[PDB]
Ligand binder design. Structure first.
Ligand SMILES: [Zn+2]
Ligand SMILES: [Zn+2]
Ligand SMILES: [Zn+2]
Ligand SMILES: [Zn+2]
Ligand SMILES: [Zn+2]
Ligand SMILES: [Zn+2]
Lengths: 200, 200, 200
């Protein structure tokens, strides 16, 4: 209704304890990576954030990950490090960051979370130092653009990465400090809400 | 009765997460191998084929394996790679290659499977390139010899390894292509069946 | 009553598959150690002996461990080696070495076990060769001192480590042979029992 979460979910899972010679290659795989985790899920950005958050709890890395709703192949040395990694992705997936509705009619959904310590997945899919804070904002395009601008007019932050909307949602990440990351966040959600009630 | 499978089974299992200094030695163990998998089973050849098939799914290798009905000690770096290995052996053991009866009286049992991509266990217990196809034929001695010959007179194949029968069954492996590996296979089973009905 | 065991127990557990950069450091952690096991328990000495006994079953080592009743952080390369390690600590904890009562009134408790092959935890918290036998004697202070002396007057053994009592119990370790380790052990328990009935 208001800002009620949207529990995302895990739809499939499977570990490949020892990726083929020929697969690791075509796949373009560091030598050190012979184990593999396949995770899929519904929300992309909420998985993106998991992939990230499991790059900190197991020595793993996101070999891959795009919107289908998703797929994230987590790479690691032995399986036991990609397990803990997957088992974490789930955990940050089944109960962590979540979209939210922006109207009551439940038909215009947004996403304002703060990543306080980027693991290696977004530090990198966004010109950043590993760990720097971040504001991951996802909303419908138009609802999106207007909200960033606001975002920005709200805190000393910068666009930390930005090809625009053309997810069928605009997403964007803003760094700066981390409180400022938060206000910006707040202000993103208000923007997007004034429009979902009355702009749109 | 006819060619009804003979489900083999797993009788025991145990991982040794960290083999003794002194055991690894007497055992003649590569340094890289400190974990160990003990598997036992009934059918030998069907385990042999598992040992093989788990050498492809976990970075493991068959440190050992002979007919007792069996024992296969799988070697690996950490345990988590010998687990996935054992868990696979089982899987290819509880539901994969299987002996079959050759008479109806259920008392003369054979084994004709095709290993399309040898892992490192048989490529090696048979002058071969790693992965080359293969025809693993097991049958009572006499039923055995007559059937190979046939085997051979059936497809362009070669004996890829062969000390003869003297398992209480003759076994033998034939390489060549892989279709030819199959006909040879077919022709092995017919041979062995004409005798189990009427030669024997 | 007499010498009835005192089952110790495991109160908490948790694996940290990938210890922080900054934690491993402050913690003073070999590079090779990125996985971590936290175990806690009631009896200290009985955990001490586990920590030890799991240093032999998984490639792990006791990064830490003191009396609180306890905490033992087990260090290892991947998690799969610290798991097997923890799972062993438990096993030698839930069913192995155990305190015992020394009176019937159940209020003066002792501990006489023989560690026949020290792993790396005590070989080292006691000038010893890795594996040398050992006699780990824990008893109330006074009950303690009198009993060692006896200990010693009983077998050719040596104090293998000794800051005295000031556990709220004196503990001490005696090496020598391993039978002699045992008599010494026996004689420690009698001593401590003559006093728990009548000295004390
Ligand atoms: Zn594991
Ligand atoms: Zn948030
Ligand atoms: Zn595992
Ligand atoms: Zn077959
Ligand atoms: Zn494991
Ligand atoms: Zn004892």
């Amino acid at each position: 209704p208001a800002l009620d979460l949207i529990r995302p979910s895990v739809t499939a899972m499977r570990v490949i304890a020892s990726v083929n010679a020929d697969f690791a290659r075509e796949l373009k795989l560091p030598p050190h990576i012979r184990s593999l985790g396949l995770i899929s899920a519904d929300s992309d950005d909420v998985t993106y954030i998991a992939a990230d958050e499991a790059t900190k709890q197991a020595m793993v890395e996101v070999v891959y990950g795009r919107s289908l709703e998703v797929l994230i192949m987590l790479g690691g040395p032995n399986p036991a490090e990609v397990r803990a990694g997957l088992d974490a992705m789930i955990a940050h997936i089944e109960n962590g960051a979540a979209f939210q509705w922006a109207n009551d009619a439940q038909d215009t959904a947004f996403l304002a979370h703060v990543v306080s310590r980027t693991g290696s997945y977004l530090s990198s899919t966004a010109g950043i130092t590993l760990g720097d804070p971040m504001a991951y904002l996802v909303a419908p395009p138009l609802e999106a653009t207007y909200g960033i601008d606001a975002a920005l007019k709200s805190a000393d932050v910068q666009l930390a990465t930005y090809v625009p909307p053309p997810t069928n949602y605009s997403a964007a990440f803003l760094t700066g400090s981390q409180a400022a990351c938060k206000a910006a966040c707040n202000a993103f959600t208000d923007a997007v809400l004034e429009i979902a009630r009355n702009p749109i």
